[PDB]
Symmetry: C2
Subunit: 230 residues, 2 copies
């Protein structure tokens, strides 16, 4: 059991420390908890893989873990919850736009059709994670500004309107922020970003949204589990 107890003691240590705090050396810890030095080494390496600690020269220090978000139709806040992390969303702005030729094609609406755009910043533990710009065919969502809690999951709101998320199509690229994106996200011109572009489709294969998400690479990891059979 001494190998299980050391892992629990490191978790308890972690609860009380700040980001950047160094752990005692591996040998001191091992002796504190009557386990091998290699046992402490391994538990620290597991924390590191979990994003909860990082190396600083010879030392292991407390890190702010990246949110590990599954690719698919799940939620940003649910992903962070799963890791014991506190995520939120902040309204940047609603914008009323119209669909140009390209966007009309993506959403399968008429050229000129009304588009409602929601822009929000995603946060975790007091720091900015990403900027989410969702363009919606406005005709599909009357009252959305009225019925929608802008801090909540838009996907849950869309599901509550009888619209099921049946198919998503993502592109994932790297990027750098422009001046506005950098200011919104506490970043600079050199900060590495993920740039995802999504179109979602409902049970009738009718487009739900086109969503652009620009995430700071230092605050986000994406995970994707694929099966051969389906």
């Amino acid at each position: 059991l001494k190998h299980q107890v050391v892992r629990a003691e490191l978790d308890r240590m972690l609860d009380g420390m700040r980001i950047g705090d160094p752990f005692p050396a591996e040998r001191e810890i091992a002796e504190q908890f009557e386990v091998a030095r290699e046992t402490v080494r391994q538990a620290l390496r597991e924390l590191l893989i979990d994003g909860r600690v990082e190396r600083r020269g010879r030392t292991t220090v407390v890190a702010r873990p990246k949110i590990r978000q599954p690719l698919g139709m799940g939620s940003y806040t649910e992903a962070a919850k799963a890791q014991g992390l506190s995520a939120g969303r902040i309204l940047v702005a609603w914008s009323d736009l119209t669909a140009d030729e390209v966007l009309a094609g993506v959403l399968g609406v008429d050229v000129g059709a009304p588009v409602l755009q929601l822009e929000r910043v995603l946060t975790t533990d007091g720091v900015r994670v990403g900027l989410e710009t969702t363009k919606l065919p406005a005709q599909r969502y009357p009252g959305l500004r009225e019925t929608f809690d802008h801090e909540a999951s838009l996907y849950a709101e869309i599901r509550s309107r009888g619209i099921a998320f049946t198919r998503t199509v993502d592109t994932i690229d790297t990027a750098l922020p422009d001046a506005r994106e950098a200011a919104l996200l506490g970043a600079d011109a050199r900060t590495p970003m993920f740039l995802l572009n999504r179109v979602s489709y409902d049970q009738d294969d009718v487009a739900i949204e086109q969503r652009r998400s620009l995430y700071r690479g230092d605050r986000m990891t994406f995970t994707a589990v694929m099966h051969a059979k389906n």
Copy 2:
């Protein structure tokens, strides 16, 4: 005939070549300016052209790779781009406690590592480092064509890829990585880490892939059911 005409043009143009102005193209093919404008704009979305000031120029397209169990070279072939793999090195390792856990092998078990660089149209795209449980693949190092698909070779040995687990991170290259990929310390990269599992859910590999962000786009098509 306008998306086709532009395709025909791109065929003959070099990276960096500027198209004629929107109005000229429109008048050349007897279509509206808006029609030319839309076609160039979706060519831009496909990554095949890019803006340079007031002009639109031919771009080197990013390879569009579906996440999953398909082929890198097949993906590039889908876009009419030539793609290949070049041997860096084979290495003989032993599994540490972490890797032994990942591969479901004993600690100390022999590990055969294959490192290769991925190229498209003469330029480097990525560094692929595959760690294999050596016991699973007798004779691989001696016989395998390192330019070919390792996934095809593993399947040829009776091992089907059934499940894959990817993590995707951003990264910057170290000195060696920068040298291998024609990059510098500031070049944005994708760092992908995969574990793949066979028909019995036994690990096949642990694969690290470091790609130049300027040469790679990942795509994912997901279904609810």
